[PDB]
Amino acid sequence: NDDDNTEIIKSFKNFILEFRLDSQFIYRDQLRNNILVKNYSLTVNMEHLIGYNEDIYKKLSDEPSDIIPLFETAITQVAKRISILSRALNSLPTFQLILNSNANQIPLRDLDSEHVSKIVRLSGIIISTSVLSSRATYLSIMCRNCRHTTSITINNFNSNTVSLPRSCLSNCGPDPYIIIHESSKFIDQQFLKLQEIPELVPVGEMPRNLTMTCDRYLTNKVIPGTRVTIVGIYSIYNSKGVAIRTPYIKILGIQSDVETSSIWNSVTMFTEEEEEEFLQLSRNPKLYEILTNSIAPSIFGNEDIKKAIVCLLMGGSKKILPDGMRLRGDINVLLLGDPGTAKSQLLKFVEKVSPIAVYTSGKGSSAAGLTASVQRDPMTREFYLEGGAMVLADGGVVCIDEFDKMRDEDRVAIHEAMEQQTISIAKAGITTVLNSRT
Amino acid sequence: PEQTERVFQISFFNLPTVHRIRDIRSEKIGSLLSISGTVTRTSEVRPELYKASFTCDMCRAIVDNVEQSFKYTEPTFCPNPSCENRAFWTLNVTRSRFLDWQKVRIQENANEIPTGSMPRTLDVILRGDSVERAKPGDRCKFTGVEIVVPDVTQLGLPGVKPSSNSGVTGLRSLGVRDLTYKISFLACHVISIGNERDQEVFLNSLS
Amino acid sequence: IDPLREELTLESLSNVKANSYSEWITQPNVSRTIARELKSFLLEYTDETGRSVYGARIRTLGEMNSESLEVNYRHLAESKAILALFLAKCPEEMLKIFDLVAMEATELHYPDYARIHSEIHVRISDFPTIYSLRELRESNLSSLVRVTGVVTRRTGVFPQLKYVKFNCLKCGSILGPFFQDSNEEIRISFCTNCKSKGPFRVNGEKTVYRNYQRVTLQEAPGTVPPGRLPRHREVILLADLVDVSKPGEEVEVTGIYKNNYDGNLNAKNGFPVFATIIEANSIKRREGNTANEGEEGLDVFSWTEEEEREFRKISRDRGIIDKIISSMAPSIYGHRDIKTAVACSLFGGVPKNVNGKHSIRGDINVLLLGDPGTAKSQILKYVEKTAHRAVFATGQGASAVGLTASVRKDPITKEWTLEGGALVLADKGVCLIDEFDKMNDQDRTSIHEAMEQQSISISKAGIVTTLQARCSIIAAANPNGGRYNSTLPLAQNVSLTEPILSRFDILCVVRDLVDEEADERLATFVVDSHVRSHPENLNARQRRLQRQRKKEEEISPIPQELLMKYIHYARTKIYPKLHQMDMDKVSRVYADLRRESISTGSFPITVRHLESILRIAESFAKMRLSEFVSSYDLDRAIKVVVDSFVDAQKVSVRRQLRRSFAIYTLGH
DNA sequence: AGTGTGTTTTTTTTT
DNA sequence: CACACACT
Ligand SMILES: Nc1ncnc2c1ncn2[C@@H]1O[C@H](COP(=O)(O)OP(=O)(O)OP(O)(O)=S)[C@@H](O)[C@H]1O
Ligand SMILES: Nc1ncnc2c1ncn2[C@@H]1O[C@H](COP(=O)(O)OP(=O)(O)O)[C@@H](O)[C@H]1O
Ligand SMILES: [Mg+2]
Ligand SMILES: [Mg+2]
Ligand SMILES: [Zn+2]
Ligand SMILES: [Zn+2]
Ligand SMILES: [Zn+2]
């Protein structure tokens, strides 16, 4: 079947090489793109696969866990065929597959005991992101007394992990092949946790969360507190309760449920056009009043108030003097007046307009560490620094409710932080200082 | 099932002397003693397997009425003398005999102690009838056999880690690691040392 | 007759004729005869009907496309009962037989319904005896029995290996799939290829997976004798059965008394104790009311399409609104305006959202001021059980954290965990509030915050979650000294803050006035309540029933259950829309609202008050049950709101203001 | 003689 | 990883 598996690999490469639309082989296009910018990753649509050949897609659906490594090997061979001259391990890193399903999404809630090791399509909001964790793409070992050195290329497509080599394998022992972690090649992995569909609101049910894993060209794409529509195989491994194992997902494709673009690295997705009309609106002074009126729908007036709001959201420029000093850019607007006057409503609207910061309330926010709370980590008795609201508000225009109702003493600690535009903490013997651009 | 013998428990009532929390010395082992303990915490009902069966599939033979002292114990070998196996035995749960047990501990009362001694707690063995007979949270007058209870995890049985004191020579029941004890009492009989507002019930029950 | 797979008469099947009952049942000959009888009565035995109710459940579950196959355990003893006793003694094997017969019935009623569920479960509802955890004896072991417990854990539902294939590392690449009890590891420890012991590993070949959910149980303290700690027996939920409950909801279920081993228990006990489990073959909740069949099974309440047709028929009937006003809390004589307010709060306004983000609450916050002993708590109790989803706030008992949003440090999991905020429990349903005028002020501000957005936002202990709180709330308050002074301004009659009364859309005040003949009627009414309440009095119960029927005729013309189903129908299908409206009528209304707050007895009138009037109009229209708001129903909403405002005023200005608004009052 | 298995109060933080 | 026990 290994020859049959190679034949299936050949069939998949025949797919990618001879799938075109209007003479355009999009797959070789993205291939050469990922050659020019060396991202060893490939994106494919299963609808295209079905159109070219149902059978290969069905074989995929039967057991994706081992079909995917064959596809990665096929893509790597294809890249070797195309981007490398003919007759010219680890010489070319393997490409990894990216898939978009567009099928139905079973809710995170009501996931069956069935669908084990089955590709699934879902959506949820991230509550936590793990740091990167390398994974041995290639493994370098030596047979200890036998001195035999061998290569291993383990894929993350099983279950849990492959046990270390046993016996001499051409007594040298139950594990002579001592891993020499220099030639061995690693790729980082990141673990993810999705809350179940905040819109689903299962009444009376605590939102269940599942763990995920991401590959080097999938990791760090999105942040916690952001909803993502995911397409990854349903995954199971043993945590260390009979015949019950940890449920998780190995992701084959990442799509943003919030749909918001990633951290803006100044790459203009709006491009020159949209910014050109933006400047035209800036060129036309009337558009200033347009933005004024547009803010706070149904407010019926208060236009100069809306102008002040627009100016504040617009962001005061922080100038860094050549001196040790630095002109303070951001400002914090104070809202005093009679109740029932849409003030909190306007605050919520403004925060919805600009999500660079987060709307909160005084009582809802923890009195201690409003800017940044200090919490004891479950696995470290040291009270770590947890990012408070103005940590999140840093880099963002933030609206908070019930200032008067809040206890005054910690609000004193807020004025200093906003004044310095940072957050200086020396509590609990920890002298960390964090910026507060809000 | 009726043919299968129903186990015998013989409870002793009206015993001459009640030793109470006092007495209970080491010299007496397996001795009938009456104690006026104040048992206020008791325990939960526990199945307390008496006898059981073993598969030993690779001999295909079946034990009858395996008895273990305190720790789950298997037959010395396969029931068949052929394929006698000291390595493997598997439970057959066929001769399963159980006695509902409750590890009732007695804390001594305030009276009858001269100098403020703490409410010394002694666990007491209880039987299914006795468990239902005993009402928890209540000081009880009880009697039964006083047995020597060994400490836990001491046996070298599989699963439970053997508890790795002084010992005799010439024994071979447990040649290594010795053993330690924590005695508990067994009460054959227990009694407490210390509505119906219906017209028909009133008329019938009332004198 | 056959040694295995036999058919015999029912009598020879019944008697074991063997030393061991379970060994006799173990004979596959006996099993096959039982299978024949099982298939026979499954469809052939049509108890009390021309059709087999079990056959009716067949292909209905097929239509439901599920796996449970409820039996009810009745029509089994009724059907010659030998199978019934056999099950009650040695279930597991004939449960498997029931699964087989389910297979044949499956493909019979619905061909191709096979391979949809590879198995079809047994669901033994009901039992001769309810039993107790205190009742669990060695006899009860390995026997399915009904129980009386309280679910506590509800662990995360986990797929579990229905089949397991154990293979040794050296010899067996793949070994045959054998069933796994899910209670303990099979641990064969023997290789077919290697006679000697070797390292064993699970087979990579896929086997069936079933759900797994452990729940701790607890004996009902009321049934438990005083001073006795209820026992706690573990029960595991399985596939097609997990996530049936809520922790602490408490159920009675019939399940086999599983018994398992664990060396740690013997170690901590020093004795050959054997761990005991149950996993109910069928699940049904015990809500504790045991009033009717709703107690049996899960949850209570119902919805009927015939009932909604009746609701439509009464809706086109005029005077429905007044009947509903009489309908709400009939056991509280008088309080016509109060009844109107609470009933329309039950109906609630229509939620409104602007641009996706901007939103208007569809829930009504009733502020009530009541003298002590004015049925306020009992009014709340009548309100609940009528709006289905409901909560009760003791007021003083709850706090800022407790009611709105709570986080609980969880030592067992080792992280901070969310604790159920009672206002989150309020969300999606009506919120009862009592003793609020006496409870903590910081908690009051927390409630203000929570209600302003109809959602609670909490960021502490690493939990930054925000929970929607859609709940119609009704605060209960006592006047300063328990008696409202009409000459006194409301704010002076109120010991609480001004902002809270502003955010409250409905204000309610209870006062003691001369009302002599009314006090005659009220005392007589309470006497009647006692008399109908007394079991001692066709018979006495018949005359109690007829007197409550006639009182239902005068007030609450719709039955209370019919009433609550009417409310459910209104929420579910009725959504009146303001398509037509009177702009300038509302304009002049708010104009008059102005220059009145200048009065010392007058609280400020704001925009949110106008939104309150709008949502009161929505609640009235929902109460009218029409999918389109009526202008004149909206007019009655205006009338109710303006009357509440006038009552809120000082009596001195109140008369001048009522004359001023008289130009509005007549239109109603 | 097989081969298996075990050792690294305080202090904020709520409130 | 690697060395005292309990039989292997
Ligand atoms: N000028 C206005 N135009 C439109 N709507 C208004 C206006 N003034 C008040 N409102 C409405 O009245 C509501 C009351 O405001 P809220 O959003 O509850 O918060 P707020 O105005 O800050 O009230 P407090 O001070 O927190 S009680 C608003 O949501 C609006 O819907
Ligand atoms: N109009 C009424 N009709 C019937 N019962 C009434 C009426 N007004 C008050 N009650 C009775 O008053 C009692 C006190 O109710 P509750 O709300 O607990 O009083 P409090 O005013 O002290 O909060 C209730 O048992 C209720 O039946
Ligand atoms: Mg506000
Ligand atoms: Mg009350
Ligand atoms: Zn070697
Ligand atoms: Zn044997
Ligand atoms: Zn083998």
Residues C136 and C228 grouped into a single domain? yes
Question: B157 CA to E5 C1', in Å?
Answer: 16
Select from C232, C253, C287 the last residue of a domain.
C287
Instruction: Yes or no: say if A108 and A196 are a contact pair by the CB < 8 Å rule.
Output: yes
Tokens representing residue C336 in the block: 């016509």
Residues with Cβ < 8 Å from A143, sequence gap 6 or more? A149, A150, A168, A169, A172, A176, A177, A178
What CA–CA distance (Å, rounded) separates A437 from A394?
4
Residues B107 and B119 grouped into a single domain? yes
What CA–CA distance (Å, rounded) separates C48 from C195?
59
What CA–CA distance (Å, rounded) separates C235 from C216?
6
> Which ligand lies nearest to the CA atom of residue C482 in the structure?
2
Torsion of CA A141, A142, A148, A152, to 10 degrees: -10
Please identify every residue whose CB atom is under 5 Å from ligand 6, which is an ion. Answer: B 58-59, 78, 83, 85
Residues C278 and C404 grouped into a single domain? no
Residues B70 and B95 grouped into a single domain? yes
C-alpha count within 13 angstroms, C-beta hemisphere, residue C651: 7
Residues C271 and C401 grouped into a single domain? no
- Cα B69 to chain centroid distance, Å, stands at 10
Residues B141 and B186 grouped into a single domain? yes
Q: Which helix (H) or strand (E) holds C285?
A: none
Residue with token string 């999938």: A218
Task: Tell me if C58 is assigned to some domain.
Answer: yes
- With distances taken from each CA to the C1' atom of nucleotide E8, the closest residue turns out to be B87
Best to test chain B binding among C266, C276, C277, C278 (most B CBs inside 10 Å): C266
What CA–CA distance (Å, rounded) separates C184 from A241?
8
Q: Is A342 annotated as a binding residue?
A: yes
Q: Which residues of A166-190 are buried (b: 16+ CB within 10 A; e: fewer)?
A: eeeeeebeeebbebeeeebbebebb
Q: C165 CA distance to ligand 7 centroid (A)? A: 13
> Which ligand lies nearest to the CA atom of residue C503 in the structure?
1
Domain that holds residue B136: 18-46+100-151+180-194
Residues B80 and B121 grouped into a single domain? no
What CA–CA distance (Å, rounded) separates A228 from A234?
16
CATH number at residue C493: 3.40.50.300
Strands (E), C242-282: 254-260, 275-282
What CA–CA distance (Å, rounded) separates A433 from A393?
15
Q: CB–CB of A113 and C156 under 8 A?
A: no
Q: Which helix (H) or strand (E) holds C531?
A: helix C516-533
Task: Tell me if C657 is assigned to some domain.
Answer: yes
SS3 assignment for B138-163: EECEEEEEEECCECCCCCCCCCCCCC
Residue with token string 């008791």: B42
Point out which residues pair with A100 in neighbouring strands.
Answer: A45
C452-457 own/partner pairs: CB under 8 Å, 24+ apart: C452/A344, C452/A401, C452/C503, C453/A344, C453/A348, C454/C359, C454/C361, C454/C363, C456/A364, C456/C404, C456/C405, C456/C421, C456/C423, C456/C424, C457/A359, C457/A360, C457/A361, C457/A364, C457/C405
What CA–CA distance (Å, rounded) separates B101 from B45?
5
SS3 assignment for C430-467: EEEECCHHHCCHHHHHHHHHHHHCCEEECEECCECCEE
CATH number at residue B24: 2.40.50.140
Q: What interhelical angle do C336-347 and C607-624 show, nearest 10?
A: 90
DSSP state of A146: G
Instruction: Yes or no: say if C376 and C476 are a contact pair by the CB < 8 Å rule.
Output: yes
The three-state secondary structure class of C251 is strand
Instruction: Yes or no: say if C439 and C395 are a contact pair by the CB < 8 Å rule.
Output: yes
For residue A128, how many other CB atoms are within 10 A of its CB? Answer: 13
DSSP state of A437: -
Question: A370 CA to D9 C1', in Å?
Answer: 30
Residue with token string 């700690």: C229
What CA–CA distance (Å, rounded) separates C642 from C659?
12
For residue C407, how many other CB atoms are within 10 A of its CB? Answer: 18
Q: Which residues of C258-272 are buried (b: 16+ CB within 10 A; e: fewer)?
A: bbebeeebbbebbbb
Beta strands A41-45 and A96-100: pairing type? parallel
Task: Tell me if C16 is assigned to some domain.
Answer: no
Name the nucleotide nearest B156; use CA and C1'. E6
Structure determination method: cryo-EM
A33 backbone φψ class: left, alpha, beta (φ>0; ψ -120 to 50): alpha
Beta strands A133-142 and A149-152: pairing type? antiparallel
Residues 200-219 of C with CB under 8 A from A: 206, 209-212
Point out which residues pair with B125 in neighbouring strands.
Answer: B186
Instruction: Yes or no: say if A219 and A188 are a contact pair by the CB < 8 Å rule.
Output: yes
Residues B184 and B87 grouped into a single domain? no
What CA–CA distance (Å, rounded) separates B199 from C92?
47
Nearest to C93 by CA among C83, C78, C103: C83
The nearest alpha carbon in chain C to B153 belongs to C267
Point out which residues pair with A142 in neighbouring strands.
Answer: A149, A178
Is the distance from the beta carbon of residue A340 to the nearest atom of ligand 1 less than 6 Å? Answer: yes
Tokens representing residue C356 in the block: 């996706």
Q: CB–CB of A236 and C211 under 8 A?
A: no
Q: Which helix (H) or strand (E) holds A383?
A: strand A380-387
Point out which residues pair with C178 in neighbouring strands.
Answer: C164
Nearest to C532 by CA among C552, C562, C558, C556: C552
DSSP letter string, C137-177? -GGGTTSEEE--B-----PPP--EESEE-EEESSS-SS---
Q: Which helix (H) or strand (E) holds A187?
A: strand A185-196
- Cα C171 to chain centroid distance, Å, stands at 55
Residues C168 and C196 grouped into a single domain? yes
Point out which residues pair with B39 in neighbouring strands.
Answer: B138
What CA–CA distance (Å, rounded) separates B100 from C66?
40
Residues C399 and C545 grouped into a single domain? yes
What CA–CA distance (Å, rounded) separates C64 from C56?
12
What CA–CA distance (Å, rounded) separates A409 from A318?
28
Residues B137 and B190 grouped into a single domain? yes
Tokens representing residue C38 in the block: 């099982």
Tokens representing residue C291 in the block: 């009033």
Residues B133 and B189 grouped into a single domain? yes
CA terminus-to-terminus distance, chain B: 44
Q: A401 CA distance to ligand 3 centroid (A)? A: 5
- Cα C636 to chain centroid distance, Å, stands at 34
Q: Which helix (H) or strand (E) holds B128?
A: helix B128-133
* Contact list, B124 vs chain C (CB under 8 Å): none
Instruction: Yes or no: say if B150 and B163 are a contact pair by the CB < 8 Å rule.
Output: no
Residues with Cβ < 8 Å from A198, sequence gap 6 or more? A125, A207, A227
For residue C111, how many other CB atoms are within 10 A of its CB? Answer: 8
Residues C147 and C169 grouped into a single domain? no
Residues C445 and C520 grouped into a single domain? yes
Nearest to A111 by CA among A196, A46, A193, A192: A196
Residues C203 and C217 grouped into a single domain? no
Residues with Cβ < 8 Å from C190, sequence gap 6 or more? B57, B58, C197
Instruction: Yes or no: say if B79 and B86 are a contact pair by the CB < 8 Å rule.
Output: no
What CA–CA distance (Å, rounded) separates C565 from C387?
9
Q: What interhelical angle do A343-353 and A303-314 show, nearest 10?
A: 40
Residues C155 and C108 grouped into a single domain? no
Q: CB–CB of B1 and C270 under 8 A?
A: no
DSSP state of A341: S
Instruction: Yes or no: say if A171 and A83 are a contact pair by the CB < 8 Å rule.
Output: no
Q: Is A341 annotated as a binding residue?
A: yes
What CA–CA distance (Å, rounded) separates A238 from C212?
14
Q: Residue count of chain B, please give it.
A: 207
Instruction: Yes or no: say if A132 and A220 are a contact pair by the CB < 8 Å rule.
Output: yes
Q: Which residues of C606-619 are buried (b: 16+ CB within 10 A; e: fewer)?
A: bebbbbbbbbbbbb
Residues B115 and B188 grouped into a single domain? yes
The protein residues having a beta carbon less than 7 Å from any atom of strand E are A 175; B 86-87, 156, 162, 164, 175-177
What CA–CA distance (Å, rounded) separates C617 from C629?
8
Task: Tell me if C88 is assigned to some domain.
Answer: yes
- With distances taken from each CA to the C1' atom of nucleotide E6, the closest residue turns out to be B176
Instruction: Yes or no: say if A26 and A18 are a contact pair by the CB < 8 Å rule.
Output: no
Tokens representing residue C330 in the block: 């009939």
Task: Tell me if C12 is assigned to some domain.
Answer: no
Domain total in chain C:
4
Q: Which residues of B156-175 are buried (b: 16+ CB within 10 A; e: fewer)?
A: bbeebeebeeeeeeeeeeee
Tokens representing residue A150 in the block: 């061998």
Residues with Cβ < 8 Å from B50, sequence gap 6 or more? B7, B67, B97, B98, B99
Question: A224 CA to D12 C1', in Å?
Answer: 27
Q: Give whole-number Cα distances, A348 to A333, A354, A357, C304, in Å.
A: 15, 10, 11, 41
DSSP letter string, C61-122? HHHHT-S--B--STTTTTTTSHHHHHHHHSHHHHHHHHHHHHHHHHHHHSTT-TTTSSS---
Residues C463 and C508 grouped into a single domain? yes
What CA–CA distance (Å, rounded) separates C158 from A113?
7
What CA–CA distance (Å, rounded) separates C499 from C497?
6
Nearest to C612 by CA among C463, C451, C495: C451
A385: amino acid identity, one letter = L
Residue with token string 């492959």: A162
Residue with token string 């389910």: C102
Instruction: Yes or no: say if A365 and A417 are a contact pair by the CB < 8 Å rule.
Output: no
Beta strands A133-142 and A185-196: pairing type? antiparallel
What CA–CA distance (Å, rounded) separates A428 from A376?
11
Instruction: Yes or no: say if B145 and B43 are a contact pair by the CB < 8 Å rule.
Output: no
Residues B70 and B128 grouped into a single domain? no
Q: What are phi and psi of A98, to 5 degrees?
A: -125, 135
Q: Name the neighbours of C, counting chains with at least 3 Cβ pairs within 8 A.
A: A, B
Residues with Cβ < 8 Å from C86, sequence gap 6 or more? C25, C34, C94
Tokens representing residue C657 in the block: 């203001």
Q: Give whole-number Cα distances, C371 to B145, C489, C508, in Å.
A: 68, 17, 11
What CA–CA distance (Å, rounded) separates C350 from C362?
5
Task: Tell me if C55 is assigned to some domain.
Answer: yes
What CA–CA distance (Å, rounded) separates C445 from A42?
55
What CA–CA distance (Å, rounded) separates C228 from B43?
11
Point out which residues pair with C577 in neighbouring strands.
Answer: C628
Beta strands A209-214 and A246-256: pairing type? parallel
Instruction: Yes or no: say if A292 and A303 are a contact pair by the CB < 8 Å rule.
Output: yes
Q: Give whole-number Cα distances, B4 to B97, C21, C91, in Å.
A: 11, 11, 21
Q: Give how far A151 is from chain C: nearest CA, Å.
A: 22
Torsion of CA C44, C48, C52, C54, to 10 degrees: -120
Instruction: Yes or no: say if A328 and A367 are a contact pair by the CB < 8 Å rule.
Output: no
Residues C405 and C271 grouped into a single domain? no
Q: Give how far C548 is from chain A: nearest CA, Å.
A: 36
The nearest alpha carbon in chain A to C426 belongs to A204
The three-state secondary structure class of C281 is strand
Q: Give whole-number Cα distances, C613 to A81, A346, C617, in Å.
A: 74, 21, 6
Q: CB–CB of B101 and C271 under 8 A?
A: yes
What CA–CA distance (Å, rounded) separates C648 from C661?
14
A373 touches chain C (CB under 8 A): yes
Residues C275 and C236 grouped into a single domain? yes
**Touching, A vs B (3+ Cβ pairs under 8 A):** no
Domain that holds residue C657: 300-664
* Contact list, C428 vs chain A (CB under 8 Å): 203
Q: Which helix (H) or strand (E) holds C310?
A: helix C305-316
Q: Is A428 annotated as a binding residue?
A: no
Tokens representing residue A352 in the block: 């919805």
Q: Which helix (H) or strand (E) holds A28?
A: helix A26-36
Tokens representing residue A399 in the block: 């609206």
What CA–CA distance (Å, rounded) separates C31 from C101?
12
What CA–CA distance (Å, rounded) separates B62 from B92?
8
Residues B89 and B129 grouped into a single domain? no
Give the count of Cβ contacts less than 8 A between chain B and C: 79
Q: What are phi and psi of C196, to 5 degrees?
A: -70, 160
Q: Which residues of C570-588 are buried (b: 16+ CB within 10 A; e: fewer)?
A: bbeebbbeeeeebeeebee
For residue C420, how many other CB atoms are within 10 A of its CB? Answer: 14
Instruction: Yes or no: say if A318 and A327 are a contact pair by the CB < 8 Å rule.
Output: yes
Select from C287, C319, C345 the last residue of a domain.
C287
DSSP letter string, B48-103? -B----B--TTTT--------SSS----SS-SSSTT--SS---B--SS--B--EE-
What CA–CA distance (Å, rounded) separates A63 from A8?
14
Q: What interhelical angle do A64-83 and A26-36 show, nearest 10?
A: 70
Q: Is A41 annotated as a binding residue?
A: no
Q: What's the sign of the alpha-carbon dihedral A257, A260, A264, A265?
A: positive
Question: A386 CA to D10 C1', in Å?
Answer: 21
* Mutation probe of ligand 1 site: the residue of C361, C500, C607, C613 with most atoms within 8 A of C-beta: C607
| Nearest-5° Cα angle at A254, A397 to A257 | 45
What CA–CA distance (Å, rounded) separates C243 from A205?
10
The number of helices, as runs of H, and strands, as runs of E, in chain C is 23, 22
Select from C175, C208, C241 the last residue of a domain.
C208
